[PDB]
Design a protein around this ligand. Structure first.
Ligand SMILES: *Cc1c(COP(=O)(O)O)cnc(C)c1O
Ligand SMILES: *Cc1c(COP(=O)(O)O)cnc(C)c1O
Lengths: 277, 277
């Protein structure tokens, strides 16, 4: 299909990454994933905003305005005739002779972006999934959506080997997030989730789900919960741009409550469904 | 110039990295840097061994024997007529459609290697450098020389901005290592350096310096020291394939002893010299 290469939409074949692109040698870059439903981009602005925020935290300066970027993403979805799926895009510090310190301000960041046709995970949304506790060994700057995802691939891989869908990370007892999702816990009608600090990424879906909770008048407490507490919850679920509201009905062979999708998860899913095109 | 691409040496212009190379999207890979002196590859075997160890730690299987790899690096040095500089080579899990977990056991890892003429840091070895303490916020698997280097890029850049040579990282007072070097201290004729565990990277130059100390009968104590104990040390220096034994005469405006390169650092350099081609 077509790829966004900086400010140009070109055939996939024409794209060539330099061996000295700082993203390829240092993972010196940031990314975003945007869900597309029936040809319409979902919360594009929230995501573009975060891309620039991520880039700013590590001092990268995107050469285009949010509007141009918005235009490019819109044109990318048109060229590829994307119906239902997602868009992936990243920005790196640019191609420059290997060195740790930041290059010269002459170096222009490299923007790559492509689309992928991918249906909604219906069975999962409906039936729920198995998860597994995996120790959080990532760096202390999880608030940046960077390309340094080695700790996350290892965790997701451990989960996959154990036949689980996601890995619920924890920095010594305290639950933080999934290898690629935010974690929610419902107990006695109340929604709990780790507060957005440096120990987790403030998910867009996480924020939309907290919004939905306010609309249906469900009390939200942004307080950390331990691994033991997580197992004693009534309902449990993870969120991400592609997973949406995915129920977690089991953790390490232990059924959450009774192993069925809870009442409030269902309610929150229904409220979320209204914000979709 | 010329570049090692898998098991071939080609013109730089012939190499093309895919956008979906896991080293570009996850920093999912490992690398090494070998110093070349007058056409001869210094401690090339120790470095080849570590590349394989590192790759094994994250379950990447390099398709060639270390023997075949040694050969290729040898042809790369000749093809580029490299006299004194270094070789940079890395291995990534390979190109596969984006996903966190490992691809099918059919995706061949991508290997890239190149050279660069770069003289020895004579002035630094002779006069010493200025450094600055920086909090270590890197992940917990520092024994792996992986491509996830955003934490070291930020620290080195901080050191650079403060007008310093290197950043000496520390996890709550305990000095671990540099952003791209190992740290050693000397107090009362005894050599101190942090133990080789998951907190630091067991450098080759570090091991050679330990051997030099044994050869010259200097006692070695592999125990951690604090940022305070570091400032009270008689001598200080950092090591790396490209820095060799670079003395540190000042940390954040605080002089080490009297701000001059010391006795034992000189002895160690002299001994290390007897190993250079
Ligand atoms: C991307 C990501 C998420 C989900 O954020 P969304 O914007 O909701 O997709 C959650 N956790 C981590 C660690 C992530 O990298
Ligand atoms: C590469 C590296 C070193 C030095 O290793 P050498 O084999 O001596 O070059 C030291 N510290 C870190 C953090 C490194 O990445």
């Amino acid at each position: 299909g077509y790829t966004l290469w900086n400010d140009q939409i070109v055939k996939d074949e024409e794209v060539k990454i330099d061996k000295e692109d700082r993203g390829y040698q240092f993972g010196d870059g940031v990314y975003e994933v945007v869900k597309v439903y029936n040809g319409e981009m979902f919360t594009v602005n929230e995501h573009i905003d975060r891309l620039y925020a991520s880039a700013e935290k590590i001092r990268i300066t995107i050469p285009y305005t949010k509007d141009k970027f918005h235009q490019l993403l819109h044109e990318l979805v048109e060229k590829n005739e994307l119906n239902t799926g997602h868009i992936y895009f990243q920005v790196t510090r640019g191609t420059s002779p290997r060195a740790h310190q930041f290059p010269e301000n002459t170096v222009k960041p490299v923007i790559i972006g492509y689309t992928k046709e991918n249906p909604r995970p219906l069975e999962n949304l409906e039936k729920g999934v198995k998860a597994t506790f995996v120790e959080d060994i990532r760096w202390l700057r999880c608030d940046i959506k960077s390309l340094n995802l080695l700790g996350a691939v290892l965790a997701k891989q451990e989960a996959h080997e154990k036949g689980c869908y996601e890995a619920i990370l924890h920095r010594n007892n305290t639950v933080t997030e999934g290898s690629s999702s935010n974690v929610f816990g419902i107990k006695d009608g109340i929604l709990y989730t780790h507060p957005a600090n440096n120990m987790i990424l403030k998910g867009i879906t996480r924020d939309v789900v907290i919004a939905c909770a306010n609309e249906i008048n469900m009390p939200v407490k942004e307080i950390p919960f331990t691994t033991h507490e997580a197992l004693k919850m009534d309902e449990l679920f993870v969120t991400s741009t592609t997973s949406e509201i995915t129920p977690v009905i089991e953790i390490d062979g232990k059924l959450i409550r009774d192993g069925k999708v809870g009442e409030w998860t269902r309610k929150l899913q229904k409220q979320f469904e209204t914000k979709i095109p």
